[PDB]
Amino acid sequence: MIQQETRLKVADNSGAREVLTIKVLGGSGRKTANIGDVIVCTVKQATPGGVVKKGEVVKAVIVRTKSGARRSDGSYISFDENACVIIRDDKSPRGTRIFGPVARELRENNFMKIVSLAPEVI
């Protein structure tokens, strides 16, 4: 359950490393957020050489969380880190390549572009 002010680990080579959740997009007042949907966020600290500087506001999709997802099958997928990928509103990532595994949730919650770029999907 990613949440307002929650800090997320960037999972791509856009130059960003850590982001701060501005708050979750969607309904009027949303308390929570799970894997699949975009969230607005500011980059809190970043690599020097990159397209994203320190302290600008961007929109990202949370790609994996340590509070897992539930499937209609009944299985569960839990990680050991909360990470997100920065996206421009066309739903394509701003990073040229991404790191680490990625949840299957992002295919039906259509981010198949990111899934295709991803190195590993579970």
Binding site: S75, F79, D80, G100, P101, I122
Partner: protein
């Protein structure tokens, strides 16, 4: 109730799963369907939990993947696990192996029991 419940769920509980313990490392074949394309995605990890009874009884397995751990949990008697095989038997003490969540990087050795 218990006897009645197991009576109405015995037909659905599976039969062809080899015995394994929470400390073992193990492979699972899951018949995920992607684009109207059924395909076995192969997952290898260390078991952590065996919990629950009847068909409710469920198990978990943990993989380290590209520097990020992933924990996969299934209901044991699920129809969409195509095949299941233990690859090595682990020698551990605890019943539920929660501490690998914190512990990483070859300090998480699992001694092979050979029994």
């Amino acid at each position: 109730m218990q006897k009645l419940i197991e009576d109405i769920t015995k037909e659905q509980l599976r039969t062809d799963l080899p015995a394994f313990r929470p400390g073992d490392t193990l492979r699972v074949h899951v018949k995920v369907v992607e684009g109207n394309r059924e395909r076995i995605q192969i997952f290898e990890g260390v078991v952590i939990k065996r919990r629950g009874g009847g068909i409710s009884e469920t198990f978990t397995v943990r993989k380290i993947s590209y520097g990020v751990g992933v924990e996969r949990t299934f209901p044991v008697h699920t129809p969409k696990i195509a095949k299941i095989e233990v690859v090595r038997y682990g020698k551990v003490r605890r019943a539920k192996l929660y501490y690998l969540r914190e512990l990483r990087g070859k300090a998480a050795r699992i001694k092979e029991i050979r029994r």
